[PDB]
């Protein structure tokens, strides 16, 4: 598996992905539909300054988030290559860019 210190611990138990390189027009509903293909979504948070080209996706289990890192990461939505990474977890303020 290649698609999956204190922080190197958090990430390894995390269930949430930071998602970037999104088209400015890509909607929360679309992210729901794409990302649900790897399992059940707990919450999605769209990045803003209006639309900002990134979001957070939090699953209920790690397995489902690993599957998004393996199979949804690196695919193309609204012509943009989706780029995901493990995130330590959302915090209030982190949805602005």
């Amino acid at each position: 598996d290649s698609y999956v210190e204190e922080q190197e611990k958090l990430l390894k138990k995390s269930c949430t992905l930071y998602v970037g390189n999104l088209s400015f027009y890509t909607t929360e509903e679309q992210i729901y539909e794409l990302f649900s293909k790897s399992g059940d979504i707990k919450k999605i948070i769209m990045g803003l300054d209006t639309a900002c080209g990134f979001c957070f996706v939090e699953y209920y289990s790690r397995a489902d988030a690993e599957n998004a890192m393996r199979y949804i990461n690196g695919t193309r939505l609204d012509d943009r290559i989706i780029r995901t990474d493990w995130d330590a977890g959302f915090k209030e303020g982190r949805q602005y860019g």
């Binding site: 598996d1 290649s2 698609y3 999956v4 909607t27 929360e28 509903e29 679309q30 729901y32 539909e33 794409l34 293909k37 790897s38 059940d40 999605i44 209920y60 599957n67 393996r70 199979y71 949804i72 690196g74 695919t75 193309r76 939505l77 609204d78 012509d79």
Partner: protein
């Protein structure tokens, strides 16, 4: 008198030791060399095998146990590399007889362990390995013939499942493409005998499972054959051909000199481990088939459906995906570099095996979405030749939609739309014009509608309307707007109209629960009260998914109060659906939040799915996606509570007292969770049985044909419940047989329960 030792030394043992080597590092290096042999090299495979045999031999004095370990592991974990490692073992055997004998013992040992732990799929690789070791002068052919004798004899045990007999037969016939020639050369009279026994057994087997597992029911252009009937025809074609096949690569043929020098070992007599109540066997299979040589007139001739080449090729490619599925780039690379003795149309085989996996019943070997990204990786890797094959394959799946199993059709829909979203949705819709003048209920126009709905969920309404030809507009999905019952339609005379106005005004200035409760008292379990509240709330949150989740949360207390009763939960769902019938995705996500926050429960949703209000949309994908999503949450909840109880017990080994009490309360919650799950399945089956019975009885009474589009869907959705949750449902045999799926049940419905039973019988 008494004297101490003199020359006063303490014996002269070394005082200190310098560390000059490391066992682990050596063992890791050996593992790396073993795993990597056969990969791309400036040197030939044969050259690398002789070298490796030399390095391993020279390490035997200290690492034999390890080396033996590694080769057994490669034996069961890398079947796609079979003839490479049997060659290697053959070289070792020729240089060292004891090692060989010892390896063979280690293999039979491991085989027995795998069998006892129910690891039958691996066991087959081990058996194939022993078989090919006969070609490498490591195992005497008559001792192999003899073990296969005991295998087939399993067809003899009394009171054991067909799937048990089946496996042993499969492991035997399976091996023949590798060792068929040798075994028949040395023992032809005795092989003819086992083929007699085997054959009589195949003729005896039941085929009750077949209709549940085929991807298509139609016989043409390609029958989907039960897996043993098919393999037996392949073996029989191999026999007619004098046991010559043109595909397998056998590096040992280059070591004729060395291997002829070596001495063989005999396998001990082998007792198949007796069936016990705890044993679990592979389910039967149906061979996915969509291509023949006529599909690829410009390529090398495709081996036939009934050739052992087709079997081996497909077997190895499935094994390649099994080894590399987690890493898609590597997986694609390994598939494309798959070698063979003669040229074959590899791109067709790869595409066929991937669909074989995605469409497999009951379920694919891996998460559905992997197949989508894998095929995309293959399109980047082979951009000059693979996309055309995939387009062609798609055109073929489409044309054969009519007898495709519903469960597979769902997967085809989800794959194709997701694929298209990766390529600006580019597709030649006019090629699928045949569908425009068919009954909208028939599989093709249905598929096209469901695909366009899926594509819209990955983009947006106008996009989709823009990419299809004007003539497909009727098949495009509706604009997903919500329907507000108390909107600006001059209907002041509707009941609760003015309460709805108060509610709206109150929500818009930001309301509390107590305030909303206050207004609602003015409504004449109170259905009307639910209606006005739900209508107005959903309408005011219509802008987005998170506005709606926000409303459900803010006014959670009102939902929980109004929907405390079962009729309340049902009415919430019914009014929600009246609001958002045009927007299936929103319906799905709202049903999900309501269950997760207990506004409604799983039983309410099950009942709702089968309700009269959903009747017009009952054959639609979104409905079944919601139902399955509901079941999945029930199942995961049970697992979670089981996991927590297991860890409370494991942890038990005042602090004690507190923990025991917690265990007691956890055990009590497991039983309650498990009973809730059973009920959900019971309800679902009761509803299927009732609505299928209504249909069958009405048709037969009225003299009309039972087999309508509606019926195909309903009977296969029932089938689909069994396919996706069979391990759970097997917990309910006694209840199902006694109370639901009884002997008097109309045979059309009973047959599905029987097909299900036939999976592990």
């Amino acid at each position: 008198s008494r004297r101490r030792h003199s020359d006063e030394n303490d014996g002269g043992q070394p005082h200190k030791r310098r560390k000059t080597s490391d066992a682990n590092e050596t063992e890791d290096h050996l593992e790396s060399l073993i795993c990597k042999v056969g990969e791309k090299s400036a040197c030939s495979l044969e050259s690398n095998l002789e070298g490796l045999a030399g390095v391993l031999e020279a390490d035997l004095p200290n690492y034999k146990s390890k080396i033996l370990r590694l080769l057994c592991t490669v034996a069961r974990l890398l079947p796609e590399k079979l003839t490479i490692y049997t060659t290697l073992v053959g070289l070792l055997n020729a240089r060292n007889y004891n090692f060989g004998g010892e390896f063979v013992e280690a293999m039979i040992r491991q085989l027995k362990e795998s069998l006892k732990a129910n690891n039958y799929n691996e066991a087959v690789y081990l058996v194939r390995f022993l078989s090919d070791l006969v070609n490498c002068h490591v195992i005497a052919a008559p001792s192999m013939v003899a073990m296969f004798e005991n295998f087939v004899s399993v067809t003899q045990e009394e009171d054991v499942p067909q799937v048990r007999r089946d496996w042993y037969v499969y492991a035997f016939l399976s091996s023949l493409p590798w060792v068929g020639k040798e075994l028949y050369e040395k023992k032809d009279a005795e092989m003819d005998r086992i083929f007699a026994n085997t054959e009589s057994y195949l003729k005896r087997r039941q085929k009750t499972h077949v209709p549940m597992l085929q991807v298509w029911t139609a016989d043409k252009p390609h029958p989907q054959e039960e897996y043993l009937d098919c393999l037996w025809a392949q073996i029989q074609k191999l026999k007619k051909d004098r046991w010559q096949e043109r595909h397998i690569l056998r590096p040992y043929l280059a070591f004729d000199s060395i291997l002829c020098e070596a001495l063989q070992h005999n396998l001990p007599p082998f007792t198949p481990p007796p069936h016990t109540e705890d044993s679990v066997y592979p389910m039967p299979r149906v061979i996915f088939r969509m291509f023949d040589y006529t599909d690829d007139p410009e390529g090398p001739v495709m081996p036939g459906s009934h050739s052992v080449e087709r079997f081996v090729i497909e077997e190895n490619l499935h094994c390649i995906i099994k080894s590399h599925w987690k890493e898609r780039k590597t997986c694609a690379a390994q598939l494309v570099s798959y070698p063979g003795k003669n040229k074959i149309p590899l791109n067709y085989h790869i595409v066929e095996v991937i669909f074989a996996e995605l469409f497999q019943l009951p379920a694919p070997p891996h998460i559905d979405v992997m197949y989508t990204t894998l095929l995309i990786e293959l399109c980047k890797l082979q951009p000059g030749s693979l996309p055309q094959v995939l387009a062609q394959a798609t055109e073929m799946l489409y044309m054969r939609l009519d007898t495709m199993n519903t469960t597979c059709v769902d997967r085809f829909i989800n794959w194709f739309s997701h694929h298209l979203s990766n390529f600006q949705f580019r597709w030649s819709w006019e090629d699928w014009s045949d569908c425009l003048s068919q009954d909208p209920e028939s599989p093709k126009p249905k598929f096209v509608r469901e695909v366009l709905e899926k594509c819209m969920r990955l983009s947006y309404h106008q996009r989709i309307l823009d990419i299809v030809p004007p003539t497909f507009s009727a098949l495009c999905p509706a604009n997903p707007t919500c329907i507000y019952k108390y909107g600006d339609e001059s209907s002041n005379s509707l009941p609760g109209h003015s309460v709805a106005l108060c509610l709206a005004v109150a929500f818009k200035s930001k309301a509390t629960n107590d305030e909303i409760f206050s207004i609602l008292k003015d409504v004449p379990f109170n259905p009307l009260k639910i209606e006005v509240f739900v209508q107005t709330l959903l309408h005011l949150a219509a802008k987005s998914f998170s506005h709606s989740f926000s409303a459900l949360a803010k006014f959670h207390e009102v939902f929980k109060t109004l929907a405390e009763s079962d009729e309340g939960k049902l009415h919430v769902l019914r009014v929600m659906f009246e609001v958002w019938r045009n927007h299936p995705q929103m319906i799905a996500v709202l049903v999900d939040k309501m269950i997760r926050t207990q506004i409604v429960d799983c039983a309410a949703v099950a009942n709702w799915i089968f309700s009269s209000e959903l009747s017009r949309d009952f054959t639609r994908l979104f409905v079944w996606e919601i139902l399955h999503s509901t079941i999945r949450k029930m199942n995961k909840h049970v697992l979670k509570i089981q996991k927590e109880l297991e860890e409370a017990k494991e942890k038990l080994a005042r602090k004690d007292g507190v923990l025991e009490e917690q265990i007691e309360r956890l055990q009590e919650k497991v039983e309650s969770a498990q009973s809730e799950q059973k009920n959900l399945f019971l309800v679902i089956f009761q509803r299927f049985i009732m609505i299928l019975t209504e249909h069958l009885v009405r048709c037969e009474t009225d003299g009309t044909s039972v087999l309508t589009p509606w019926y195909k869907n309903c009977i296969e959705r029932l089938q689909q419940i069994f396919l996706q949750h069979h391990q759970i449902i097997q917990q309910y045999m006694v209840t199902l047989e006694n109370l639901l799926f009884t002997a008097e049940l109309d045979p059309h419905i009973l047959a599905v329960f029987q097909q299900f039973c036939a999976l592990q019988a």
